Nucleic acid binder design. Structure first.
Ligand SMILES: OC[C@H]1O[C@H](O[C@H]2[C@H](O)[C@@H](O)[C@@H](O)O[C@@H]2CO)[C@H](O)[C@@H](O)[C@@H]1O
Ligand SMILES: OC[C@H]1O[C@H](O[C@H]2[C@H](O)[C@@H](O)[C@@H](O)O[C@@H]2CO)[C@H](O)[C@@H](O)[C@@H]1O
Lengths: 437, 437
DNA sequence: TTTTCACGTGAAAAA
DNA sequence: TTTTCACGTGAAAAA
């Protein structure tokens, strides 16, 4: 798709309140005559950098802030220039999450952290530690239930446990992240991922469990706990499950440390609707009534807007969300973040499946997360060097075939021309290429 | 994932009644003690042949019958051997859909055909012809609505119109499909795809419209018509939309000809639970109560089970589904069907997008849908040949470097060795490789 | 950092 | 059908 003057197209992930967001768009259209279409395509955070590089893609893209630095580094985002008055309405630290190289590159919407979600009827007293989950599962398995099910396909969900005893993504020092100091392969990271793999080995979890499988199992009353974010609460509300939201369990006596995301809205640099997008975000979405419409659809978490967060903070589930968030860390927004996430995703999936040992999976993840992506020009230099290497050899063989008079067959390969050349120069060449004088 | 004794795992597409099917699995568990897990992973029809070739995958896989011949040809499916008593319970033509090389390779469940779905309040008298939809849209756009929106990303939904004037997949003659006689590039197919592209060029449809975008627009009352199958009726019921289901429009005076699918359930050849899977399918799912539970979740269409279809056939929506199905054709189940579908998908997306002309897109689709996939042995033959060709050359250069005593630099490539060889044989080789005596 | 050669599949060609 | 060479990026090496 390409953006067109006079209409707004928004992309947002399918686990968020896109129907509530569309109601906001319908009000924007009611007051200004500008159509707003909300879409939730799959893998939007990978599609956006592919299409926006040439001016395609939506007017506005919603994702957690960790993806946005790479978008800005590629020039895909318009600089966000809210007046000081508007900036004041949002918590300072949410603006920090969307600051890249000194510029604001998105509007912050809401703060997301994972929490432990548990079925109060099956589990009145949720476990305080990861270590006691195996025995809790054994007791539940005898009732035809399980202890815990959560998405093992996305490393976001396993990261709180990997980070608990010391794993980290990029080390922060002297005011900046060191993209070369990755902590996915230290003792704490191994201890965390070993405990998860051990859960699978002992049949307390299944390696293939994904988002929809864990959500169905919890919301149908088949497992006593899951790990998820606020967006998941509305589907649990509609289910028959009486659930609670609480702090994640400790591991080796230390808090689980979820990576905290700030859902943010960036404006496509290629949009011809930049001013309409700013009006929609600042004056319709980032208002009490705006965030309420989206929040009523799927909870946003702790919104960046101070006036409405004063209402949402009253909610015990938000209090638990932010207890977990305080124990975690805000994600970096640096371009290297996507390479870090791909590396850890591969490591978790390969260790859970048994395709790699924990040490092997994390050793590769450390190397992959730190690997510098070759620039376009570096790839092009390499492409041209081999093109030229082939073109020089091809010219040599062309001239040998045309002037050699080598008594060759009608059809033969260049190895046979090379052989005839060798013998002409006084060499002997065996069938397998063994060559001597 | 791997199958394991005493447990049943089922894969079904996410637009079907998987919650209702899980209800049948829960009754199975109560009666026999066998746990049943229903999953709806993405792209399951592509994942299944990838994992089943090695013994992985689910116990049971649900898909339209057109995919199953390819699975059978690869040895992925157990032969289905129901007693005559049970075969008698399903319509003979549904069994024909799951017979491949003389053997039954799945249980038929239900017959699917696309119909025209229309908003009664927006459009009390739906159009009878494709040709009048442009002017209908113009009139509707003045009121802020649109005429028609349907999934343009999957060629299933566009095929009815492509086939209307004479497009076809594989020609049927003398009792067999001719895998080399593909009809995606004749005048009838060109005419139908041109009309569709013309719809986009005149702004009556959007090239990027997919399943969820079209579903949302119809169910929110923004478009007067959509094209979809029975599984979609349940979300329309829940909406505020008053809808009818009717015959697809004609094109150039001829009926739209949907490809008719038979939702079918195959048993993984690697499953250690083949007998339990037979019992689940024959005695729990393919009963009045089992199909009812699934149907109440998302309508199945015209079920293969005679006793329950006598009840369903009385729904005017099913009568319209079967009026469309009579005008269409049952899909082949031959292994080539997947190559046909990929080819047409690429043609529709490329023409709708403007990257290719309709003629250019359908020309490639014809060759693509007829292309014979090279065998494993053929690929390995080619791989080894190049391995061998490189090894011969490398041995030659190893011998020249070791015994040539050419005045070579410390580090140089094999082109520089070739050059020295040429000069020794009496040749002159310029920098770009131009070679002569 | 740049440089060499491996790698297996596609496009072109001859039959 | 088989055959040749192009193609660009990865593994290894030298610095
Ligand atoms: O799993 C890697 C993934 O983690 C985060 O994505 C979260 C997202 O922040 C949440 O809004 C929610 O949708 O769940 C996602 C995980 O499935 C990162 O934001 C993302 O970049 C990263 O790939
Ligand atoms: O679009 C190509 C696709 O068409 C059919 O898939 C249908 C399926 O039969 C229906 O049950 C429903 O789910 O919609 C699908 C289209 O998205 C073929 O059965 C399938 O093999 C083919 O790829």
């Amino acid at each position: 798709m390409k953006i067109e003057e006079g209409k707004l197209v928004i992309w947002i992930n399918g686990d968020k309140g896109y129907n509530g967001l569309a109601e906001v768009g319908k009000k924007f259209e009611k007051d200004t005559g500008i159509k707003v279409t909300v879409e939730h395509p799959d893998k939007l955070e990978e599609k956006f950098p592919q299409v926006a590089a040439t001016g395609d893609g939506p007017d506005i893209i919603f994702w957690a802030h960790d993806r946005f630095g790479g978008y800005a580094q590629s020039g895909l985002l318009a600089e966000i220039t809210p007046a000081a008055a508007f900036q004041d309405k949002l918590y300072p630290f949410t603006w920090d999450a969307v600051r890249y190289n000194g510029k604001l590159i998105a509007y912050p919407i809401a703060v997301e952290a994972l929490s432990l979600i548990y079925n109060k009827d099956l589990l009145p007293n949720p476990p305080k530690t990861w270590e006691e989950i195996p025995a809790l599962d054994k007791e539940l398995k005898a009732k035809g239930k399980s202890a815990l099910m959560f998405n093992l396909q996305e490393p976001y969900f396993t990261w709180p446990l990997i980070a608990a005893d010391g794993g980290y993504a990029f080390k922060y020092a002297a005011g900046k992240y060191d993209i070369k100091d990755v902590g996915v392969d230290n003792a704490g990271a191994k201890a965390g991922l070993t405990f998860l793999v051990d859960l699978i080995k002992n049949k307390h979890m299944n390696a293939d469990t994904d988002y929809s499988i864990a959500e169905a199992a919890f919301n149908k009353g088949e497992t006593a706990m899951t790990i998820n974010g606020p967006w998941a609460w509305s589907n649990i509300d509609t289910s028959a499950v009486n659930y609670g939201v609480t702090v994640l369990p400790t591991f080796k006596g230390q808090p689980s440390k979820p990576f905290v995301g700030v859902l943010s809205a960036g404006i496509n640099a290629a949009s011809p609707n930049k001013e309409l997008a700013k009006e929609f975000l600042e004056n319709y979405l980032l208002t009490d009534e705006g965030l309420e419409a989206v929040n009523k659809d799927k909870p946003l978490g702790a919104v960046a807007l101070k006036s409405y967060e004063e209402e949402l903070a009253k909610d015990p589930r938000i209090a638990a969300t932010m207890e977990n968030a305080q124990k975690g860390e805000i994600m970096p927004n640096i371009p290297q973040m996507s390479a870090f996430w791909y590396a850890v995703r591969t490591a978790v999936i390969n260790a859970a499946s048994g395709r790699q040992t924990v040490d092997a999976a994390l050793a590769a993840a450390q190397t992959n997360a730190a690997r510098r992506k070759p620039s376009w020009r570096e790839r092009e230099n390499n492409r041209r060097r081999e093109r030229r290497r082939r073109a020089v050899a091809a010219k040599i063989y062309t001239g040998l075939r045309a002037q050699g008079d080598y008594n060759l067959p009608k059809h033969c390969d260049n190895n046979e021309v090379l052989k005839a050349l060798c013998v002409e120069a006084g060499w002997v060449v065996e069938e397998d290429g063994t060559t001597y004088r």
